[PDB]
Structure of Putative transketolase:
Amino acid sequence: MSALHALVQGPATAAAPRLTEPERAVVQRELDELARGGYTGPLLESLRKLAAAVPERLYDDSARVLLRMHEIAGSGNYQSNLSSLPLVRACFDLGLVPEDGPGPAELIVGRGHIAPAFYAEHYVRGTFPFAPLATLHQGGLTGVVHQDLGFTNTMRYSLGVGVAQAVSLAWELTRRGEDRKVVCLAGDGELQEGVVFECLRFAHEADLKNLILVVDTNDKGIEPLLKPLSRGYLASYLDRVEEVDGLDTATVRDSLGALLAAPTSAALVCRTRKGDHSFKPATTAPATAPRPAKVSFANTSGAALAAYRERTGRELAVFTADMAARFGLRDKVPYTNTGLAETLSLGLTLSLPEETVKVVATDAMYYMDSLSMLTEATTSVRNLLVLAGRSWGAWGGAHNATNLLGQLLHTRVYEPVTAAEFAACLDRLDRHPDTTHVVSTVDAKFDPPPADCAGDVDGGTWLTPPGDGPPRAAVVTFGYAGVLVAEANRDLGVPHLHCAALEPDLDARTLAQLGACEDLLTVEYNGVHGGFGERLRTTYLLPARVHGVRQDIANRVHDRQLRLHGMGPEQLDALLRGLTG
Amino acid sequence: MSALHALVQGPATAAAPRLTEPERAVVQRELDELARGGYTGPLLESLRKLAAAVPERLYDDSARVLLRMHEIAGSGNYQSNLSSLPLVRACFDLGLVPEDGPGPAELIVGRGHIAPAFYAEHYVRGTFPFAPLATLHQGGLTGVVHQDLGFTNTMRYSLGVGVAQAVSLAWELTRRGEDRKVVCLAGDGELQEGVVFECLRFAHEADLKNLILVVDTNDKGIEPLLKPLSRGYLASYLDRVEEVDGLDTATVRDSLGALLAAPTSAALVCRTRKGDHSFKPATTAPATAPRPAKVSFANTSGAALAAYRERTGRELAVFTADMAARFGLRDKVPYTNTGLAETLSLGLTLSLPEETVKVVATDAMYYMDSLSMLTEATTSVRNLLVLAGRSWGAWGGAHNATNLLGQLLHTRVYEPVTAAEFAACLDRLDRHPDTTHVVSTVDAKFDPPPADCAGDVDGGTWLTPPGDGPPRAAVVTFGYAGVLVAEANRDLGVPHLHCAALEPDLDARTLAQLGACEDLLTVEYNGVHGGFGERLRTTYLLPARVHGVRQDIANRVHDRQLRLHGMGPEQLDALLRGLTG
């Protein structure tokens, strides 16, 4: 059976109960012709022909169907696509999107959260069906651009790569020499990085002429920007710059049509506006007794840091790579925001006094771009704390960030899963004033586990102590998985050991009673390469199986993703019975 | 005994035979008062008092003594310091270098190859002796700035960190609020990076006022720059910019004295000139039968790539992060230079056709700054070759670059040590058109080993086949060490196994005959963390000792550095006898 069938069948029929009768009938019909057979091979054209089979068109407008997608999925960046819809409309009007074959110009969509807008305008043209649309951020479709959906790009977790791809293609076109225009889409806060500066600089040195930029400046990134985008910086490194509104499709279409004629490199500043970044659905539950927002560990950091500062009396300098509204640091401790500059967040903390404790925090998968700077700080600064969050949500993930952070010089890595473990990790910065500490805080929504590593963080804490006699089997876990396995072990009670340290210092009794077991398993929710299981294998010579994040991180919501990696409660329980076998 | 004694005793008396009689007498006298005792504790003030003990001054000029240092050491960047001497002279004239206590302004030396110039001007003041000066790039003194020699900085292998440190200190000074000027020294090609852009951008957003830049633009980096430094880029992000000559000390001193008064952030463009980057001593051997330059593997890459292109007929696109004159690629294959943009070198190779083989090459310790971009390419591009050179010379090294490169997604890493291994690795890019290949080419000067891994690179090749009977011991090596151990094994003939793959696929017979050995040793010339020895340990459960690069990379020439890590022929032979024990 072909890929698109398994791609679309699950989330569509799963969301079928929450659907309208015309849309329910349309989805049922699409499933009908899908079951008629003949849908195999490449994705995009198979979907296009599938839609061409059913000429039914629900709406004559795109905003409504995009809203339907977002509300059914209940996630994504709906406001950004509302903002950006005129741009995609104008691009489609010019024919920049070729229906069949190569168009009159190549195109490089650079922003990674304007993928659904393309699905939107595709529905009016009658080239995409409605069954996948109800599968947004659920495994069916993809919130980020990708090759096999009619684009010419590919996007990963990181940011800023769009301009790099466009400049690579432009340099190619200039090398062969076919004066063919490449138009690339750029974001507002994605120029705060440094990679785009390097790509623009190379474009200017080589006197490139076939590069066109359409950048949208809504004046607000994830947090309101300190100062608007540096227009002199754009002007210096490119021949021409212009700015128009992001609401009137006619102006954008006319501007790009005129600009596609002149064979000179230029950038277009599509001024736009937007509100809150993320999306909050209108809860089906009406106004009732107020719902207390359940707490993700990405929201207990601020409270613990404030508690530490009051408890000890030291001074905290806080830099968080412009994700304070994500770490809960707001309203708890003072902090200074730096914007989309991940290397800079680490760079600020070198000249600070040796007596001042400093914290740098962000999603771990950004540190990939600043390891060099990090491998200076861990040698020239003291009293440093690193917070590496994990959002393997709808967007994606580099499953190696923790493993690479834990292989630099004089660095320790921890994954606390309670409030006592976090407090002990905070306390650590007076016993090891030289070794830089890193904390990995999960995004999970879960009740606190009963017991933890209270004060001996670098040791092993039994969450289900092993029984007496010859130990036949045991399971060793790491951090969040320790919670996740715990809820699946309350029935079996398999001997379960937790360790809040990526490089634990297991002692003689623990290892001795662990080795007599005939089979050992590790359940780590981090990258297998350079990770807890094989670090145990290499340090202690443990014949232990490893089952962690094996392949790359897909783009699904957290529940379906837990299902994907073999980390769901059902599959974890099945693995636990496999241990009990 | 104190540190400075062992610091200075070795290289000084070692270079004593090649010295002048007055300088020989001066060095002998300095050794005399050093042996009188009382030289313990902190380095810089101990050296200053040691020099104050002997008021003798050889020269009244600095260029001559700096030349003496360079010629005795026979390495470094002599031309750059000749160029930069007026800057340091003017800085000393203003009192920016405080003799005792804090001066009227803080200072941040940013370039990493203007350390000897400070030693130079220190000799005229009679505050530094002459014994350490004959220990340049030999363990005595340091070619890069460091904390304990009268500076306020620290520098690592990477570039661009100087502006980061200066901006951190400036933000501190503004936070407390003491309107105190911080003056930082900047290089020409060290603004081609992106980190300095991020730091300057942050300085401008926060409306910083106490940051002063003195940047020297000799118009030539390691290779002549394509276009001069972007003056509009400097002007946009800073309040004031000025440019003067780098030859008249009076103009620079006057300009900085005037600028130290006005409390507004500004940058000074000290225009300068220089010739060849590195240094070549006048050979003591006169004009004889022409000496054929002995070949380092950093000079066989171009020939092998040209041989591959002619042999197969494909098309090569070559990007080398502006180090072509270092990889020998010159005059062998065409290439396009990108300058000091290490992320960009990888970024260019995404939109290239799937039928075109591409190569990206540089010193591995720069890839630390672009791993994220790399972990996109290895998933979206095919026919990619990575060349990771190793220069653990006088400057320093991040001993983890290979280990981190080999832990990304769909990547293989190799260390060929012949010409057949390199050819087979080139051939590999038609059997694995999906997995990105990485080649690690040493800088060593050595005769080719007798045998190698000719075609089965991912296997194990016996360089000294094990004898019959019960195998008591064996040694497993990796790449350059295989050569280095070989020259130390021709006498003992210890069973020695070479493997040109960081993740070798050892087969049943090899592992079976390896396991019966009572003791196993690994001799790897890469980083121990995440390296060949422990990768073997974790993959194959081998009770094997590891002896590789343990601590950080010091700043010495290659021979003394081989002595330092326990990798010298004498210590390696001692380890081999320890195996034979």
